[PDB]
């Protein structure tokens, strides 16, 4: 029931929550845009990011555990669950202006959840925490059991 976490390598993490598994990646790659995708202003908006209701509370807990402040921090971005491409929930943690303090807080949240956490964010460049639910096209082949078995 309660979530369990693991670190595959320097950019790949996973969370198991209930019957669902989530790919968590930290990188300088983003495919979402505020112009087109869903801004998650309050936790209830996470429902627009995920089909299954059961998978929503784990992401809500994860965001809290990272230190995200729903009242004061910038909104997360996610792909609308109605789209073909699959779940993609994104924290902007760039070591740049307007996200420098936020980014360090979220990274410290990652260090508290994964002891082996590696910071790949270069100063003055974009950096993201990306969540995809295993089984959506957006998780590609990274949730095959050849990957998950190495984590646990």
């Amino acid at each position: 029931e309660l979530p369990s976490l693991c670190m595959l390598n320097n950019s790949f993490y996973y969370m198991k929550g209930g019957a669902n598994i989530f790919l968590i990646r930290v990188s300088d790659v983003s495919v979402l845009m505020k112009e087109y995708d869903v801004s998650v202003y309050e936790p209830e908006d996470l429902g627009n990011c995920l089909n299954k209701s059961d998978s929503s509370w784990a992401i809500h807990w994860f965001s809290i555990a990272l230190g995200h402040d729903w009242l004061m921090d910038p909104p997360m971005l996610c792909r609308n669950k109605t789209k073909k491409e699959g779940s993609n929930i994104q924290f902007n943690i760039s070591k740049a202006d307007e996200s420098r303090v936020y980014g360090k807080k979220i990274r410290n949240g990652m260090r508290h959840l994964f002891r082996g956490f590696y910071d790949p964010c270069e100063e003055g460049k974009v950096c993201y925490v990306t969540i995809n639910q295993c089984g959506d096209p957006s998780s590609f082949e990274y949730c095959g059991t050849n990957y998950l078995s190495k984590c646990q």
Partner: antibody
Framework: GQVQLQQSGAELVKPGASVKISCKAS????????MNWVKQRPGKGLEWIGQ????????NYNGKFKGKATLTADKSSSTAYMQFSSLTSEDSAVYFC?????????????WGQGTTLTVSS | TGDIQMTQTTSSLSASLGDRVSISCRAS??????LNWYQQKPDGTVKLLIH???RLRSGVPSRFSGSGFGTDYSLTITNLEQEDIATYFC?????????FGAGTKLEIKR
């Protein structure tokens, strides 16, 4: 390498017949983008026919082209197809395939060169 | 509701090299800045110039710019060049069915 959409050659078809034209894609993940189709006749602007998502075979049609147009796709050859039924002279036109960006933004970021259909006896 | 009708009230215009021109596009419903501009060359090749009202695609000259909101939109070409001879089409991406304006043909005065 770069994205390319290669459409099949011009077709001459008798009224009442059917024809299937194709759009061969290269340079990107064919299963991860919508392929849209567009009809151009002179002085008739551009008309959106419909779209297919080769990832799951799902289709959406402009109601004006339902039954007229049938969209299919073959992931193994990265090819999208448009089949016309019961052709008439109003179907004489240039037809474009065009892909949407990753994430479905309803802009067409790469276009085929067009296929000219002539319906005539 | 009904399909969104896209109207380019000017079907053709002509201007001198270096002139500034603007091409109007209006929609019959609020399209919330989901408005894209295409350039079709005389040989029929189509290129996306601008998406989301004003976002220039990579490689597109900065002479091209887009403005608008709600129902009313505009493509502006400054410092018109020989290579800009083409027909320009607007397109709404708010909702299906996707719909296009009828096109505005641009020719050079000499």
């Amino acid at each position: 390498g770069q994205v390319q959409l290669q459409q099949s050659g011009a077709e001459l078809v008798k009224p009442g017949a059917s024809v299937k034209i194709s759009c061969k894609a290269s340079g990107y993940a064919f299963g991860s983008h919508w392929m849209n189709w567009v009809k151009q006749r002179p002085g008739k602007g551009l008309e959106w026919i419909g779209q297919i998502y080769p990832g799951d075979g799902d289709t959406n049609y402009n109601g004006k082209f339902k039954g007229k147009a049938t969209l299919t796709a073959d992931k193994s050859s990265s090819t999208a197809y448009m089949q016309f039924s019961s052709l008439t002279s109003e179907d004489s036109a240039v037809y474009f395939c065009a892909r949407d960006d990753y994430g479905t933004r309803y802009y067409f970021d790469y276009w085929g060169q067009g296929t000219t259909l002539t319906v005539s006896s | 509701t009904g399909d969104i009708q896209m109207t380019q009230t000017t079907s053709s215009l002509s201007a001198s090299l270096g002139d500034r021109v603007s091409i109007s596009c209006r929609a019959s419903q609020d399209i919330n800045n989901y408005l894209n501009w295409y350039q079709q060359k005389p040989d029929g090749t189509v290129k996306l110039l601008i998406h989301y009202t004003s976002r220039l695609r990579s490689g597109v000259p900065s002479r091209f710019s887009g403005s608008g909101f709600g129902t009313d939109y505009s493509l502006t070409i400054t410092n018109l060049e020989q290579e800009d001879i083409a027909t320009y089409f607007c397109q709404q991406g708010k909702t299906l069915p996707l719909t296009f304006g009828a096109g505005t043909k641009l020719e050079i005065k000499r």
